[PDB]
Design a protein around this ligand. Structure first.
Ligand SMILES: CC1(C)S[C@@H]2[C@H](NC(=O)Cc3ccccc3)C(=O)N2[C@H]1C(=O)O
Ligand SMILES: [Ca+2]
Lengths: 207, 557
């Protein structure tokens, strides 16, 4: 039936989920994740939303502020609200599967609550689609696809111009922080293709 | 992060081999999560960071996939024009526009809550404001609005059965990420995925742009423009955070460069050593690259030239002799904590001295510090991630290549002195430093090896386990946090695919209230250290044959 979910763990504990629709498949996934990694996932949720200080104290206030300042949560919720039913079923099933295990944990904590919750002094709460989405968004996107140093670059360029003069300072910037270097080893060989765009290399946006 | 994809013309006893080593650092419990999904159009196996819905490392019995960070420049900073007369507004397209804002309160365990405001413009969230110049800086991401689409693209790509189906999903992944493909027929492919801005003419992407309207991005570049290759003539696709393609620009981070000195060359040397690679040989590239000193190849020639006229008894010459006899692979002595050869220490001291004398001296403070690192920076717990050639070392390598370098040496980093003189001076410093620590007999120098730590704090620096759960490995290995290998059409099996991975310390992080750790809490630790690997099962029959437990749930939505 559409209500059945089979979970099989192999000899290393790796789980395999068997189900007949999207929501049920991702529910099985969330369920086994909550069994294996609940504390890790709770702490990843707090890291990705900036709510670590709630449980760990004052040493994490600047961290939490920095996380919240680097995203716009309502926009992520708007993206979720635009999903088709099928796509939403991925996130909803996952959250609903974690919650089924979390509710079991909180009903029998004396045997099922991960020891770390007792150590750190709090208990797990349920998850929604936004939370599942934010584990990804807060790691892959907001940390591993969000790298710039342009304000520092401008400060370096200004210091180079003050040391070497305008022209030589721009040329030393191009020696230390080149736009492109043709001797760089490239995953794609030159015979195959090359990138067709050429970029300004003298800060002409403020010329 | 590294990856090598070996296609039909380079594979031995198989049509394609994919070996991935994503480097995120090392954590307890494991950074990635092993999972198989079967039904609702999926049939997949692998492991993935933070148990995302989409498996970043895995296969579906027809194709396999993996990733490495892309490091393209998909982020620009806009300098917004403010006015003291109109707090909370900025000038855009001839009008004073209201910033969007939200209040946030940080609740604090055993402390007072703190409330602050987050501000946002048409160009992104505000990072910092200079009241002296009435300027606010907004960070603009080419993928803004496509985060959820990216998660879904990484999920839906698991159902692709060919390159066209797979690249339809790659085109929907907006973050800067290298994606890789292999399939049962021996095809291999690569896409440097993501959204990249179509910038106005004259916009230097390394530096901020005015936010008043004229410098706004035109839109996004089309997917045609993303660097990609399918079945390259070389027969292989290798990456270790290096450039995707000739003339493609890197991230604007000042300490990140794509130049003539690149660690990916160590993978090319191994893949080109022999005409073809078996799966075993492809896996062994992990072990060798993980132990390879990355500076020896770059600087040994300069060291040999500098010392070529010296007498046999000159210690500057004897340090170079020691390096010349070495292949750069570090191995632990029998004590389990010192390296058999002293070469990395020699290179570290030498390069530290060289950078101080050259790139550091050319750059104003406090920027100079930015160029002083040798790349051998660590902690007693060892490196927090991969090891690489430092920014200063990459710039020094262009200088020591002389006119072989394509980068104009606007400032002579040797300041008018012969490069040999500076190289020799750094060798004199090296001899003094190391002989004072170890004595004058280089053959008995037992230099410390770097170690590896599975940290109990996640990469954000936030506890994800108790401190006592940290695990330690004597040998630092410059390799993936996990490693996975997929072999297509092996001649040694009738199965269309075979695959293996390693998820250390283990699949489970569970500890019961009484302190009893799960049976799968630490059963992959020794396998990780020894370059072992476990089978990834896909089919119903293989999973059943290797079953330890099962549960059947009955649930209605
Ligand atoms: C920019 C970063 C925070 S993320 C990048 C790299 N991480 C990886 O390569 C891991 C990864 C693998 C597959 C997909 C995404 C990221 C790594 O480490 N890099 C960091 C850095 O240089 O500070
Ligand atoms: Ca930029």
């Amino acid at each position: 039936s559409s209500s059945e979910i089979k979970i099989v763990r192999d000899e290393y504990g790796m789980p395999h989920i068997y189900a007949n629709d999207t929501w049920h498949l991702f529910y099985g996934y969330g369920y086994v994740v909550a069994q294996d990694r609940l504390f890790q996932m709770e702490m990843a949720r707090r890291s990705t939303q900036g709510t670590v200080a709630e449980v760990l104290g004052k040493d994490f206030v600047k961290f939490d502020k920095d996380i919240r300042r680097n995203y716009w949560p309502d926009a992520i919720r708007a993206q979720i609200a635009a999903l088709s039913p099928e796509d939403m079923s991925i996130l909803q099933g996952y959250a609903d599967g974690m919650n089924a295990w979390i509710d079991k944990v909180n009903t029998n904590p004396e045997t099922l609550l991960p020891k770390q919750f007792n150590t750190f002094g709090f208990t797990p709460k349920r998850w929604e689609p936004f939370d599942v989405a934010m584990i990804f968004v807060g790691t892959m996107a907001n940390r591993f696809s969000d790298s710039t140093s342009e304000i520092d670059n401008l400060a370096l360029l200004t210091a180079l111009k003050d040391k070497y003069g305008v022209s030589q300072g721009m040329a030393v910037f191009n020696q230390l922080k080149w736009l492109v270097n043709p001797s760089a080893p490239t995953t794609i060989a030159v015979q195959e293709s090359n990138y067709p765009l050429k970029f300004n290399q003298q800060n002409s946006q403020t010329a | 992060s590294n990856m090598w994809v070996i296609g039909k013309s380079k594979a031995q006893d198989a049509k394609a081999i994919m070996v991935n080593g994503p480097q995120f650092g090392w954590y307890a419990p494991a950074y990635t999560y092993g999972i198989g999904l079967h039904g609702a159009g999926y049939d997949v196996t692998g492991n993935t960071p933070f148990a995302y819905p989409g498996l970043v490392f895995g296969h579906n019995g027809v194709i396999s996939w993996g990733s490495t960070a892309g490091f393209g420049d998909d982020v620009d900073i806009f300098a917004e024009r403010l006015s003291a007369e109109k707090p909370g507004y900025y000038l855009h397209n001839g009008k004073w526009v209201k910033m969007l804002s939200r209040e946030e309160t940080i609740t604090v365990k055993n402390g007072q809550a703190e409330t602050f405001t987050v501000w946002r413009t048409v160009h992104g969230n505000i990072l910092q404001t200079d009241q002296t110049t009435q300027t606010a800086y907004a960070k603009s991401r080419a993928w803004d609005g496509k985060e959820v689409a990216s998660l879904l693209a990484w999920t839906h790509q698991m159902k692709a059965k060919n390159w066209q189906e797979w690249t339809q999903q790659a085109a929907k992944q907006a973050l800067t990420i290298n994606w890789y493909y292999a399939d049962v027929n021996g095809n291999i492919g690569y896409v440097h995925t993501g959204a990249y801005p179509d910038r106005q003419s004259g916009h230097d992407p390394r530096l901020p742009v005015p936010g008043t309207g004229k410098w706004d991005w035109k839109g996004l570049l089309p997917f045609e423009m993303n660097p990609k290759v399918y079945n390259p003539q070389s027969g292989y696709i290798a990456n270790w955070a290096n450039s995707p393609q000739k003339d493609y620009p890197a991230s604007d981070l000042f300490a990140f460069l794509w130049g003539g000195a690149d660690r990916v060359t160590e993978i090319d040397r191994l893949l080109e050593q022999k005409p073809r690679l078996t799966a075993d040989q492809a896996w062994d590239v992990i072990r060798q690259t993980s132990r390879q000193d990355l500076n020896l190849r770059l600087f040994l020639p300069t060291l040999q030239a500098a010392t070529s006229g010296l007498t046999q008894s000159d210690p500057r010459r004897q340090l170079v002799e020691t390096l010349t006899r070495w292949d750069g692979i570090n191995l632990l002595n029998d004590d389990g904590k010192t390296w058999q050869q002293p070469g990395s220490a020699i290179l570290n001291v030498w390069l530290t001295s060289m950078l101080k004398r050259t790139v550091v001296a050319a750059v104003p403070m406090p920027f100079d510090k930015w160029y002083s690192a040798s790349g051998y920076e660590t902690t007693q717990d060892g490196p927090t991630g991969s090891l690489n050639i430092s920014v200063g070392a990459k710039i020094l390598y262009e200088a020591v290549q002389g006119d072989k370098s394509p980068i104009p040496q606007a400032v002579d980093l040797f300041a008018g002195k012969p490069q040999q003189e500076v190289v020799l001076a750094a060798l004199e410093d090296t001899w003094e430093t190391l002989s004072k620590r170890y004595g004058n007999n280089v053959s008995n120098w037992k230099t410390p090896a770097m170690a590896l730590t599975f940290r109990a704090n996640n990469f954000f620096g936030v506890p994800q386990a108790a401190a006592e759960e940290t695990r330690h490995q004597a040998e630092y290995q410059n390799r993936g946090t996990e490693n996975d290998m997929i072999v297509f059409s092996p001649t040694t099996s009738d199965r269309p695919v075979l695959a293996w991975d390693v998820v250390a310390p283990g699949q489970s992080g569970f500890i019961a209230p009484d302190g009893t750790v799960d049976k799968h809490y630490e059963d992959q630790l020794k396998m990780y250290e020894n370059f072992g690997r476990k089978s990834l099962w896909l089919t119903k029959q293989d999973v059943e044959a290797h079953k330890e437990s099962q549960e059947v749930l009955h649930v209605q939505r």
